[PDB]
């Protein structure tokens, strides 16, 4: 109790970007 900070939308979008990036690097690495 005392106003807890909440993560922003930019951070979530950033996370999704990194994850998708890992998919691209994984497919090219395994190719």
């Amino acid at each position: 109790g005392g106003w807890d900070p909440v993560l922003p939308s930019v951070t979530i979008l950033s996370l999704f970007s990194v994850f998708l990036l890992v998919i691209l690097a994984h497919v090219l690495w395994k190719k």
Binding site: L13, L21, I23, L24
Partner: protein, 34 residues
Amino acid sequence: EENPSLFALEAVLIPVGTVGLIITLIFVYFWLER
């Protein structure tokens, strides 16, 4: 009349680019088979 700020938005900067390349790559893998 429109603004270029929204055209260079975040979705075009990384998610659209990665999603497109990822979909194309997985399709390429399926085509190759082995």
